[PDB]
Write a structure and sequence with these properties.
The complex is a heterotetramer, with 2 copies of chain A and 2 copies of chain B. Chain A is mainly β. Chain A has 1 helix and 5 strands. By secondary structure, chain B is α+β, with helices and mostly antiparallel strands. Chain B has 4 domains: 180 residues, Thiol-activated cytolysin superfamily/Thiol-activated cytolysin, alpha-beta domain (HIV-1 Reverse Transcriptase, Chain A, domain 3); 53 residues, 2-Layer Sandwich (Carboxypeptidase Inhibitor, Chain A); 117 residues, Glutaredoxin (3-Layer(aba) Sandwich), CATH 3.40.30; 110 residues, Immunoglobulin-like (Sandwich), CATH 2.60.40.1430. In chain B, strands 4, 5, 6, 7, 8, 9, 10, 11, 12 and 13 form a 10-stranded antiparallel sheet that branches. In chain B, strands 16, 17, 18, 20 and 21 form a 5-stranded antiparallel sheet that branches. A 4-stranded mixed sheet of chain B has the order 1-14-3-2. Classes of the chains: A mainly beta, B alpha+beta. Chains B, C: InterPro entries: Thiol_cytolys_C, Thiol_cytolys_C_sf, Thiol_cytolysin, Thiol_cytolysin_ab_sf, Thiol_cytolysin_sf.
Chain lengths: 77, 460, 460, 77
């Protein structure tokens, strides 16, 4: 189970990372002009837990369990 | 060891010595500075037609992709920096290649989607791969991502074919043939000709610097292999580091007008004499054809331009230019075109007129002198002084005359004398002036009385 | 079946349709028929310099091997009949090839010794093989078998670079650059320029027609393979069927002289004005150099020629030309070069003199008329009649005068009258003649008595 | 045991023929402007038997037992 995972908001995350055992899902988020690509827990793919942890006020997000599924064009700016 | 082989090849490329920025130099005509002067008269003007040697030096890194070399240009192609390149008909080095990574900069291709890898790169496979990616982009992102064109514009006043080859590449005498450049018209100076090149780029395919020169060849290519095939200091290797895709066209402008801002006019419509019929040679665009369009009219060209200001996103765009880099240090390769050519320069000296008007209540005397440029029987230039046959004659109750000079007259001198009625000084110089330019129309008018004569020298 | 694959490929080549004898056509300048006339006078002659459009059509099957394409020409090489070929920078079709048989026609190679077979033909291997054979011949038969040269000679009066490209190939603007063609000199007509190409052939390497088109490709090359690589009716395939080895050179001839048989002079020394300094660009010969030699002198060129009239037989000779054949029907491929160019033609009209001599014992009257070609202020041509100011005046105890006319005079008319002493007919026409050409020197002399006057009109 | 064998005088015999059992040698002959390449008996590699059988009056000849040894440049015109 591998996801595009980057430590900071990148406008183009190319790093394919094997997620650990804590995470079981791929998250991608668009919040303003920024993009996020992270390994994520499916239990926390909700607006309240995503906004607060990423310290963002408004966003759209997408969670999936397929390999390398959290790519930027899953959302539409 | 498979790593000593890498060092041998890398050592061989790095061991080549060449002038990195003079090895690619095209030399057109070399000419002695022979001059020439034709001169003649026609209604209203004295025309002088002067021929002089002139040089042009143009440097360029973006070479053109024509139908003659499209089968040969592709991201990552290995070429010899030799005469073939200067001619824009480069040569593929016939040798196995290494895996090539290409990046296409179309909008919406994020993460890794913008990157290809071809393990046996050739013109067939790399194109098939680049097209697959562009088409995949058309199918997934073209309807929510617009692709405007990046315009690159260049223009020049046409003087000679060798002059145009230096500006647009030796390639040009073939590509720009459908323009049918009226070169008979320029040596007589009856109209001006401007060739402009328009390049509208929608996207590029590029290659990043490989880790080492050996990465561009097969794992088994040896310094001997390159030495056998003529790859050395005379003709070092380059690789296509970038290909620009889009639409390109050449446009001709035949202007009867004699204006000067003719170019600034052309340069300004690309966003004032709407004379000049236009001739366009479009290279690319929709397959449904229209390779050549003509004539103008005015801004059907302007319509032709905007027609390709956005990527229609129906098919992959056509290759229109490429850039090469030296394998040695991955620096961009610049081609330098130099040539001597004969620039024809027409100069018109407009005719002029001098009017003498006497309305004073006194007798007047006019004196008119001037210089005259001419030729003798052998055709050699001559400068001579002249005099009006009317000089010195008594004039006028309502006397008036107009002297019409051809353009080859200059430095007019004028004197005006009037009768005073004084026995001790019968004539007095009312007015005199030298070095008078030949303006279209000049009046020397005198009026008044004997005791208080008046005059005016007026340019109408 | 491995024999159905053969038919597929043979069917594809034979299925191509193209104008077998117009597909290879180079088109230089296309020009409108714009004319021009300069005219002026100088000591002894009235020179007229006329410019006129002219065309040249040259067909050729023997193309030149330069340093720009030597890495690419070899017996059996597969080339695309396309723009690259017309430019003499052909393109190797990148595809596996079949086994190629080559025959070298050096004397003494009998039975089978004159034949090679290369299983993976390339520029490296075929050359290495051809050289091995030539060297093996040098070691075994050169000292008892002489090899004279087969001379091929071509020459032309230089007028324009595009004119010379048509005569010698688009290649020429690069190969013939060290000649530094004085093109400024020809538009003034102060001297003539002739470029000649000498090709001394010592031996050839040739390829016989393969059994079928499929034999030229790898056993596994497919019609698709050729379609993917652009081999089709637009650009059908050719193969190098013959390479000539030896020595070649270009020679320039700058002649101040105005003679006509200048070329017949040049054409005759190759086995009469020894004016003109010479400039040679030798292509091949001994490695010890002498790429350019100049100037003349007289027949150090003649020495330069004979120096390579026999194969020195120290090393394999240099490739200097090649011939291609269509893969479809193995017929020789002819390239056709056409171009329009401006031919400058100088015409000199020599001055002349007319002498009148009166030595008769009677009073005489001379009348001289002539026509005169000239221009007006606008430069337009004019023809006008003229008269000698001495017409009609009584002449002579020992009267003589010489009339000196510029070359622009023509159609002289002369009359001579003498006093008779008869009251009813005082003057009689001794002589009269019209339409007299302007010869260098003509005498009208009269002598004798009143009753028996004499005259003579004599061209000196 | 193969020799260049041609049925008639050729100025360039390229045919490599396996000689039969009657012949055990390769003959080549230059007689005037003509050349001969034949399978031959070694017992008959003498001037008298060669001239008469080939109906030639003057000639030089060469006989050898090595394969493809009767090539034209064995003699010198
Ligand atoms: Cu480019
Ligand atoms: Cu004008
Ligand atoms: Cu040839
Ligand atoms: Cu002359
Ligand atoms: Zn969490
Ligand atoms: Zn002048
Ligand atoms: Zn006029
Ligand atoms: Zn005027
Ligand atoms: Zn997007
Ligand atoms: Zn060139
Ligand atoms: Zn009045
Ligand atoms: Zn004239
Ligand atoms: Zn003169
Ligand atoms: Zn004279
Ligand atoms: Zn011999
Ligand atoms: Zn050309
Ligand atoms: Zn006397
Ligand atoms: Zn016998």
């Amino acid at each position: 189970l591998q996801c595009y995972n980057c430590p900071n908001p990148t406008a183009d995350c190319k790093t394919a990372v094997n997620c650990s055992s804590a995470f079981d899902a791929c998250l991608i988020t668009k919040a303003g002009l920024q993009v996020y690509n992270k390994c994520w827990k499916f239990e926390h793919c909700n607006f309240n837990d995503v906004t607060t942890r990423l310290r963002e006020n408004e966003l759209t997000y997408y969670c999936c369990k397929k390999d390398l599924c959290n790519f930027n064009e899953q959302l539409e700016n | 060891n498979s790593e000593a082989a890498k060092k041998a090849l890398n050592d061989y490329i790095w061991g080549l010595q060449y002038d990195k920025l003079n090895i690619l130099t095209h030399q057109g005509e070399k000419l002695k500075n022979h001059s020439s002067r034709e001169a003649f008269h026609r209604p209203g003007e004295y025309v002088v037609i002067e021929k002089k040697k002139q040089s042009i030096s143009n440097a360029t890194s973006k070479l053109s992709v024509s139908s003659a070399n499209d089968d040969r240009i592709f991201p990552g192609a290995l070429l010899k920096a030799d005469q073939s390149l200067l001619e824009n008909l480069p040569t593929l080095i016939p040798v196995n290649r290494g895996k090539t990574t290409i990046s296409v900069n179309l909008p919406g291709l994020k993460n890794g989607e913008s990157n290809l890898t071809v393990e046996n790169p050739s013109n067939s496979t790399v194109r098939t791969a680049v097209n697959n990616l562009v088409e995949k982009w058309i199918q997934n992102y073209s309807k929510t991502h617009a692709v405007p064109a990046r315009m690159q514009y260049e223009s020049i006043s046409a003087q000679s074919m060798s002059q145009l080859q230096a500006k647009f590449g030796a390639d040009f005498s073939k590509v720009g043939a459908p323009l049918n450049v009226d070169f008979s018209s320029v040596h007589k100076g009856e109209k001006q000709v401007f060739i402009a090149n328009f390049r509208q780029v929608y996207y590029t395919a590029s290659v990043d610097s490989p880790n080492s020169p050996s990465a561009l060849f097969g794992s088994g290519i040896t310094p001997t292999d390159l030495i056998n095939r003529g790859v050395n200091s005379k003709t070092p290797p380059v690789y296509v580091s970038n290909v620009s895709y889009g639409r390109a066209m050449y446009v001709k402008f035949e202007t009867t007008s004699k204006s000067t801002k003719v170019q600034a006019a052309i340069d300004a419509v690309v966003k004032i004499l709407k004379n000049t019929k236009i001739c366009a040679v479009v290279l690319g665009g929709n397959p449904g054809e229209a390779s050549k369009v003509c004539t103008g009219n005015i801004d059907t060209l302007k319509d032709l331009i905007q027609k390709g200001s956005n990527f229609s996103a129906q098919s992959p765009a056509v290759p229109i230019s490429y850039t090469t880099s030296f394998v040695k240090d991955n620096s961009i390769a610049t081609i330098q075109n130099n040539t001597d050519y004969i620039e024809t320069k027409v100069t018109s000296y407009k005719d002029g007129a001098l009017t003498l008007n006497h309305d004073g209540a006194f007798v007047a005397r006019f004196y008119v002198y001037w210089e005259e440029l001419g030729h003798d029987a052998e055709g050699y230039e001559t400068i001579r002084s002249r005099s009006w046959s009317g000089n010195g004659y008594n004039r006028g109750a309502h006397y008036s005359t107009t002297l019409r000079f051809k353009g080859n007259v200059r430095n007019i001198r004028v004197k005006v004398l009037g009768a005073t009625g004084l026995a001790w000084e019968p004539w007095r110089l009312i007015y005199s002036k030298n070095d008078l330019p030949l303006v279209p129309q000049r009046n020397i008018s005198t009026w008044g009385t004997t005791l208080h004569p008046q005059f005016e020298d007026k340019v109408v």
